[PDB]
Amino acid sequence: VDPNQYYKIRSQAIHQLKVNGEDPYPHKFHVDISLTDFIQKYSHLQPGDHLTDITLKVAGRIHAKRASGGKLIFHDLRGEGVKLQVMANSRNYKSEEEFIHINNKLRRGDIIGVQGNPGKTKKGELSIIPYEITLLSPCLHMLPHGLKDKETRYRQRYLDLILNDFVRQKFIIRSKIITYIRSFLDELGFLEIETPMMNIIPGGAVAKPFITYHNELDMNLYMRIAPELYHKMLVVGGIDRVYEIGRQFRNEGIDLTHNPEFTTCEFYMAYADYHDLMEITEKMVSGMVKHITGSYKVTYHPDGPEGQAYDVDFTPPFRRINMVEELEKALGMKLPETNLFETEETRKILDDICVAKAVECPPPRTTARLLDKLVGEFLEVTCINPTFICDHPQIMSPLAKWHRSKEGLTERFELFVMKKEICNAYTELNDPMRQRQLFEEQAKAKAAGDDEAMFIDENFCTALEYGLPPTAGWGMGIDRVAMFLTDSNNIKEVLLFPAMKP
Amino acid sequence: DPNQYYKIRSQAIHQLKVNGEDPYPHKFHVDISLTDFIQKYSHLQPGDHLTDITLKVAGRIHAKRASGGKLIFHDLRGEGVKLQVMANSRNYKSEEEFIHINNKLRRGDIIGVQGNPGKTKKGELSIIPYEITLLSPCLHMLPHLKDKETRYRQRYLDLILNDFVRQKFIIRSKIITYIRSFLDELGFLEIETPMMNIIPGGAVAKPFITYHNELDMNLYMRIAPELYHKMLVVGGIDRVYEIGRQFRNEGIDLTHNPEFTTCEFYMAYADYHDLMEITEKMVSGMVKHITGSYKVTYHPDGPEGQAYDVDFTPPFRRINMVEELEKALGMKLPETNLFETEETRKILDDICVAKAVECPPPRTTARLLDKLVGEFLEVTCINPTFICDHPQIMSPLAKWHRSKEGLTERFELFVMKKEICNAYTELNDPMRQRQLFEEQAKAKAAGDDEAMFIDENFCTALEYGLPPTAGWGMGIDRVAMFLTDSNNIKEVLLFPAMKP
Ligand SMILES: NCCCC[C@H](N)C(=O)NS(=O)(=O)OC[C@H]1O[C@@H](n2cnc3c(N)ncnc32)[C@H](O)[C@@H]1O
Ligand SMILES: NCCCC[C@H](N)C(=O)NS(=O)(=O)OC[C@H]1O[C@@H](n2cnc3c(N)ncnc32)[C@H](O)[C@@H]1O
């Protein structure tokens, strides 16, 4: 009854079968039909039926084994997210002696192959009356009673998938999101590409990277934090529309919305601006929600199942707000003119404001970091429905093109849904001279203690000197999308094997 | 002089900014692509000029030929297509502006063209512009590009000047899209598993090591996702697949890049025999669907060498590794149940020395066998060939062969002398898997940097019950190589790894 004792007893038993030549891990079992197809094919049977003219082979894991005498055993077979009952009757088994022998060997959790006839019990339960049951793979451990401890579910995802059917549904939704994006972009003529994940200098975002070393080339390398720079070089190369759904690596802390490795979808469209991208984003996100959930409305539980429930409407158009103007409205005070957002005086003003508003910001207390903390405190929390926060200051967007009418701002937007950032996009900065200037400013910030400041990428600047057409780029966090599409407040729910403390 | 051109063009572009001429405009509205423009106006006759139709197109200037002072021809290219821009002063918005824009434009500049469709007296489809806008200038002089180093170091230049490069990458994307479609139709669930692991596994390879600061932990970049996939099958997801990057800290060569893409899939209740049939159907169907024929031309010695047509029509040839190795060597090898003895290792060592087959330390049986197979069997696999029943000593994760002692239910697919797929009936016995892991740990301590680490978490997962399963792995880059008649993996990688 003790788990460790159960494991020792079952292990010795299975080992005995091996020495005796009983083959507890057979090489092959021919499955004639899946459980799902079996259910749809014989669900029309009537209570008490027993189809003696059809013999099929099925397989699955034993979820329960209840004895109804010495000659009747019921096995609850599960697989493919469905259930199928195995009505093991001694009179129908190949022999009474073998009926007792196989059932005494079976335990809950074992993988078995079943050869029998379809039938339905007197109570109306579809079943398979077996002629022969074969042990395919025994379960040496005791399975949980259920399984609710988050730590165990995340450290042994196979147990979570075996015991909780809602978990499989979340990962099916996640795959539907990725497949929907690929179909959407492929239809628009985008070419799916793959760019390096190991870089001499990481770039395309503000983040601390992972460091590794290549022996044969005697070189230090960084895991990519974003593929943005390689994508723009491809647009310079003449591939007007490219996209890539892949992993990004950021050596930062783990929390409800951050994992060291995560999946994003980045795409670049030549001859487009951030205004075109807002419309494309509205069409893609709203259509994705409708296609997967059936409607434009989604229920949101910010405080778990026992909390308030909010209806989130994804019907376009999405609301748009300007970051600086809304931040001033939230603070009830006017901020400096946008063309002064790069001065030290503006940094001191924002620093003082953060202190007075109890908005914390760990060093370095740079304008970009202080603004980010203020936006997360006063604007992000109010973005329940899909909201576009636009025209970010240049100081927070070293790769975005300057705003054509608002000095000091950029043609950028971020899509927020259920208090989380989903997309990051902007009109691409294609002026090589101005890009190098912003890179030089980033290097100074880095040399002064900023682990996330960008490195100067001269190779990328050189590519921009060859001519990058006016372009608009976009990045979406696939994990974050799966979170709001599965009503999950923790990113670990949408990652098969999330990063964990040892 | 290239540098002088860059300095002069830079000052000219800088002057445009100070003069308020916006050399990098924010938005240009394209009415139709170059491809659609050509297909839509293919019916014109020489001398035609549809003055009642105005369209806006865009592209890069590849050539600029002057004819008079009032006529300039711009060769606009984009999307792998070309469109001539017949800039006539009489048709431009104004003669003064015609001279101004043309004095600013140079070869390589990205421009927007607003004009009418037309055809020259010589019969060339063109666009007669009303206004030309400089969208993004090219500050460098372009090659009037064959140097491999430059093509791989500045892939944008390669893509701008040689159309065959873009075609290879379109084929590469078609391969991946085809596999997803094939597997999705068979009920496989596309999944994503960790690329950063506490313990690397799923292959015999040297990994990359990194460090997580917030958690003060050493991490390894994944060398294969195999172990996570099998854990997913234990979890009840009978069919999973993942097309993603793998990282191996090894040397670069014609068929190896430190980061590469593979497609791995696991299907419960199948064995390696079922996987051979699936491989034949997928590979043959993919070759036919993308290239139009079941045959592909292969140039092992470049364009000026022998060309062999390889037929991908199933079934593929099957050969047993040990049996054909004996025939290729003309010598009888030890019995398969003796492959773990020191006497067998010495025997394989002598054979390698006598046949001049090199093998860097450690000279273990598994490594000596791998060298002999690559020298006597792989080179002879031009047509799609399955090499099967590898010894257990070289397959720590494959299930033992049900009839041949010492062998496993494993196979490798070889095409045009390159390894394409690696598959086998999965070992689902946790005690025997742990034993093989212990043997791998011994080999690691004895000089084999590629030997596997013991993964107790995976062994524990096998203790919960892994149904009989067969797994498979395919090198996407290698497939793109043989599908584009490329002998260097750098041809099918947008940015291949390069020495600084
Ligand atoms: N050219 C326009 C910008 C393109 C995208 C840009 N290169 C970029 O990296 N933007 S990002 O905000 O830094 O990341 C893109 C999205 O990835 C999501 N994400 C980002 N970091 C994490 C982390 N740590 N965990 C989980 N999800 C994350 C998040 O939704 C972002 O909106
Ligand atoms: N469970 C059955 C086996 C599944 C696949 C197994 N985990 C595996 O990794 N096999 S592999 O041979 O080591 O890699 C799979 C394929 O990736 C290809 N490949 C392997 N190494 C490289 C490298 N360095 N560069 C480019 N391509 C590579 C190669 O074609 C392989 O056939």
Which chain B residues contact residue A469 at CB under 8 A?
Answer: 58, 60, 110, 135-136
Q: Tell me which residue in B110, B189, B210 faces A223 most closely, judged by beta carbons.
A: B210
Q: Is the CB of B364 within 6 Å of ligand 2?
A: no
Declared resolution, Å: 2.5
Please answer whether residues A484 and A177 qualify as being in contact, where contact means their C-beta atoms are separated by less than 8 angstroms.
Answer: no
Handedness of CA B347, B350, B356, B362 (dihedral sign): positive
* B58–A271 CB contact, under 8 Å: yes
Q: How far apart are CA A433 and CA A436, in angstroms?
A: 5
CATH class given for the domain over B2-142: mainly beta
Amino acid at A482: A
Please answer whether residues B446 and B362 qualify as being in contact, where contact means their C-beta atoms are separated by less than 8 angstroms.
Answer: yes
- Kindly state the helix (H) or strand (E) to which residue B284 belongs, with its residue range: helix B272-291
Could you give the C-alpha distances from B92 to A268, B74, B98, in angstroms and in order? 33, 14, 6
Domain edges within chain B: 2-142, 160-492
Task: Please name the method used to determine this structure.
Answer: X-ray
Q: Is the CB of B418 within 6 Å of ligand 2?
A: no
Q: How far is A332 from chain B (nearest CA, A)?
A: 33
Residue B100 token pair: 């101004």
Atom of ligand 2 nearest to the CA of B397: 1
Q: Say which CATH superfamily domain A163-494 falls into.
A: Bira Bifunctional Protein; Domain 2 (3.30.930.10)
CA dihedral A111, B456, A255, B235 (to 10 degrees): -10
Q: What is the DSSP letter of B188?
A: P
CATH topology for B160-492? Answer: BirA Bifunctional Protein; domain 2 (3.30.930)
Q: Which residue has the tokens 């979170």?
A: A483
State in Å: Cα B370 to ligand 2 middle.
14
- Best of B111, B494, B495 to substitute, by most chain A Cβ atoms within 10 angstroms, is B494
CATH class given for the domain over A3-143: mainly beta
Q: Is the CB of B410 within 6 Å of ligand 2?
A: no
Q: How far is CA B215 from the centre of its chain?
A: 34
Question: Which residues of A are annotated binding-site positions?
Answer: 204, 228, 250-252, 258-259, 266, 268, 421-422, 424, 428, 477-480
The neighbour count for residue B485, using CB atoms within 10 Å, is 17
DSSP 3-state of A256? coil
Please answer whether residues B261 and B477 qualify as being in contact, where contact means their C-beta atoms are separated by less than 8 angstroms.
Answer: yes
Q: How far apart are CA B226 and CA B474, in angstroms?
A: 12
Ligand number nearest to the C-alpha of B257: 2
Q: How far is B137 from chain A (nearest CA, A)?
A: 5
Q: Is the CB of A480 within 6 Å of ligand 1?
A: yes
Which chain A residues contact residue B184 at CB under 8 A?
Answer: 179
Q: Which residues contact B432 (CB under 8 A, 6 or more apart)?
A: B400
C-alpha triplet A26, A30, A34: angle, nearest 5°: 120
Ligand number nearest to the C-alpha of B378: 2
Go through chain B and tell me how many residues it has: 500
Q: How far is A441 from chain B (nearest CA, A)?
A: 20
> A472 burial class (0-12, 13-18, 19+ CB within 10 angstroms)?
buried
DSSP 3-state of A62? strand
Please answer whether residues A248 and A231 qualify as being in contact, where contact means their C-beta atoms are separated by less than 8 angstroms.
Answer: no
State in Å: Cα B262 to ligand 2 middle.
7
| Phi, psi angles (nearest 5°) of residue B297 | -85, 140
